[PDB]
Assembly symmetry: D2
Homo-oligomer: 314 residues x 4
């Protein structure tokens, strides 16, 4: 009986994401928000033979009605990358977007799970947290930076190289969601896999640059949409399952953390009825993986401070 809001539902990620959500028997009400096209998207989806009641909402005047009574809010809203851009180049525009939408969440559904897809996640989660603090309703167990696509990619790339079924591969990925902050823990992969250091370095590099690879491949027509819809759907379903009392639900996500000196960090999280049940931590890692964690912390701290400083000027 989960009530889910999608903010940015008319965009490239938002539409196929809303489809996957509508198709699931976990969702009872699907409220869609954007600045354009939502009524059409809602009409389209409302015809699908599943139980989820689909409602479309349009413009900041209707945003409160979209959020009212929501259990989960997913935020794919945001400007995508063009070839040559870094995720950091999107900060100025997407920071304003996230601050506005999460302010409405703080006011109208403060108890909801907030899942931010909007890049750069390393900065937009700190923004979300500070906005919630401003409204006096900050719960760090309920705010999630969606990094699930990194794990999905890692699983796929490991499966391809080792001739495995990616459905039965699980690579923990930690740190953040940008460049060298993406740290795939191949040593913790199930099933156990052994790559030589040159192949391991190549695999790790491809995981880190996978987003840019897709941006390049689309050649100006945006960034990952369909795989991001898949990964965002996976995360929401995991979260909704856990809220309904499903046990053993573990997902990596960029959250308020005390695992490192970084105040926000991605690690495997046991999810439960109140959101984050337990942060399962970094765990035992190789020297190579330790080196990556060390190199990533400087950029993570910088991205975090950037997001915090943006909210200070509001």
């Amino acid at each position: 009986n989960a009530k889910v809001a999608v903010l940015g539902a008319s965009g490239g990620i938002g539409q196929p994401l809303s489809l996957l959500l509508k198709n699931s028997p976990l969702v009872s009400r699907l409220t869609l928000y954007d600045i354009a096209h939502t009524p059409g998207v809602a009409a389209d989806l409302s015809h699908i033979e599943t139980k989820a009641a689909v409602k479309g909402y349009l413009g900041p005047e209707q945003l409160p009605d979209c959020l009212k009574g929501c259990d989960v809010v997913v935020i794919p809203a945001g400007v995508p990358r063009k070839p040559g851009m870094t995720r950091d180049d999107l900060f100025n525009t997407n920071a304003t977007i996230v601050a506005t939408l999460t302010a409405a969440c703080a006011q109208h559904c403060p108890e909801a799970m907030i899942c931010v897809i909007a890049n750069p996640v390393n900065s937009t989660i700190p923004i979300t947290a500070e906005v919630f603090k401003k409204h006096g309703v900050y719960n760090p167990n309920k705010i999630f930076g969606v990094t699930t696509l990194d794990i999905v990619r890692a699983n796929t790339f490991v499966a391809e190289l080792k001739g495995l079924d990616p459905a039965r591969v699980n690579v923990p990925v930690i740190g953040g969601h940008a460049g060298k902050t993406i740290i795939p823990l191949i040593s913790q992969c199930t099933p156990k896999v052994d790559f030589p250091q040159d192949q391991l370095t190549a695999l790790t590099g491809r995981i880190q640059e996978a987003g840019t690879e897709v941006v390049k491949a689309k050649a100006g027509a945006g960034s990952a949409t369909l795989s991001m819809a898949y990964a965002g759907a996976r995360f929401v379903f995991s979260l909704v399952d856990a809220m309904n009392g499903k046990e053993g639900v573990v997902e990596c996500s960029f959250v308020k953390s005390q695992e490192t000196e970084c105040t926000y960090f991605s690690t495997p999280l046991l999810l439960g009825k109140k959101g984050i049940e337990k942060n399962l931590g970094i765990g035992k890692v190789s020297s190579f993986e330790e080196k990556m964690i060390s190199d990533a912390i400087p950029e993570l701290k910088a991205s975090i401070k950037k997001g915090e400083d943006f909210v200070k000027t509001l």
Copy 2:
């Protein structure tokens, strides 16, 4: 184990359809075709953690490679309606698209199952058949006009009026896929439902004009995409299941038919390893439903001849 081609994979229907197919454990290879953007879409989808190998093809030169060894070909390729248009306003453009694509199918994967989504279906299926006849490889048990969205809509609308779960509702829909040729057999609905004639006529009208309702809702941004992807995926999965040896698989579809005076007609079909195993026919219908069939036949025969005459001029 199925090898599925999606012709028009970069379009509004094509992209979410390709996503749903990539997510399926029934698909082992997914080849995508379009005249633009296919490499970007293929790169996007290839990151998803499922077994299906994804490959993107671009331009008519690469169309043969896309079709090589395919088991099922799905054709969402086509121009969508704008508000005010009838499906027949798309005839000239989509007839040419279907004629070109199905000609490539006849040459390069004649044994494959051909699922045509491109509208107007009442003419484009006749076009497909005549193209296959011209190449001397016409198998009427393997060419399908996808009407599944009509059934999906009928199930949803009946479920909403009776307060049922759409997953437990099954409404046979017969005839064709345009206006009054869409004939929902509410008298054969499982479970049995009783409407007074005024509500039954309103429900019947809603099902018939649902496509136009979505076009009006999208207000220039195309026609049904996400619900059509769902409906298209449903039909493909039913078909692939039946091909692997699943029993009792029944789907309505616009096909070569001897059930009425129309040479092509939509009825529930028992699917199997060779495609259509048995046409289950119209069955017993109400007087109201009998009148709808009688009134639809002239339009169906007209649309069929229009498609046949188009191929005849080529």
Copy 3:
């Protein structure tokens, strides 16, 4: 000091057309209307260092304000063709667009010159006329189906074949604006040009199919925009010159006509202070050109009745 309104100013034709008008010393006020994006287009254009005052209007509330006091209204509003479509395939969408916009013109600037670009012109001019008749303000000397791009094309193609300066070439084009109804009168060209038959036939066909040529070349990204903006601007400037009292201003345009049995027809028109001063008629033509007129008449009459019937269904 002309006041010009552009209805559909945010579209593919509208924006470059608006630029050309803003750049002209003949325009003192430029009012722009559309259902989206107009404020941004007006803001952009308002920075240009010419005298024309630019104002952007958005939505039905503001449409009357755009039209009040206008000398000329240009209506590029309408959906463009995709490859394989005929101009007639756009009728059912563009008919309502033209009906709505010309009704506002009839109410708010009935004395203005009404220049309809929206296709299919052979049907949308009849619509415009009947709308003006319904409002009791029909002046056939002020309603113009813009065929100017046919003449511009003919001039270019003749000039290229003969190696002439296209600025010194003038080819009358008569009939209508769709395929075989486009009748270039190469026999009346200035300077007089003599082509061998095979070149003459190829030239004539190229002129007739030029729009489809551009649609093909654009491969789904619409139809002629930049050259249509040029041609539309040329026609407006000719109208304004004539309104300012310039002598001998001649333009072909699709207008109410008694030159043939067709109630609307394009011929060279002497323009004056009140619009059409004198219809100069078909004049002396060749046998090849006479046969083209004969072939065009049935299609034109069909297109005209289609537009007339549409208004009668309202």
Copy 4:
């Protein structure tokens, strides 16, 4: 006689710019380049009844054919701003675009005038210069950062405030093209105008933020396109006129400079057959203007350095 290449001809600026160039009797050959849509744009423009021969080129394989024999190359190519973005956010994308395109210019038409519109101009001109240096063909009198839109805006705003014909207004604008580096010299305006400091400050701020104002007004639909096409065309025509031997042609442009400590800077330039004939310098300025110059130099220096360092990484 002038052969002009437009690199980025299919974009928002490129299309209307190409139209204005096609319309000009100063242009005899027009070559259009982009990575998509160019064939359609070229076909469209090739129908216009002016002498300029139009040809379209698609993809890096055809870029050399586009550039050979060119007298002037204009580069509007580049990603536009979204609301929130600074021009600096576009650096990474547009730097790569400019680096690639200007490398091709240095290889295939090193004698051509190079007019860079792509922002941030304060960095992309340094990129252009260094790329030409690498190929041993650097001519600083032929490389221009197009700042003309700032002058066009200043003229319009001054004219509007004083009720003047903007055609008779001329405001020199110096420095660069980004925020506080845009320095309008109102003290050197012709005709002489007098504003109180409060008005002068607001007018000055209005000119500096004009680009951001349009981005806001377009609300996500890009940045200035039509006015930039006007301003780009103006500059190209001034340059081509000067190349034809017209005397007294003066335009402000961001060029290699020794007028200040900045190695690149915008001031009024006397144009001629060699490109830059003479740099006319800053001239006599007010205290207010002197202060703006002092405050801008640090940012200009950083932008120049940033561009130079980028080329080192290639």
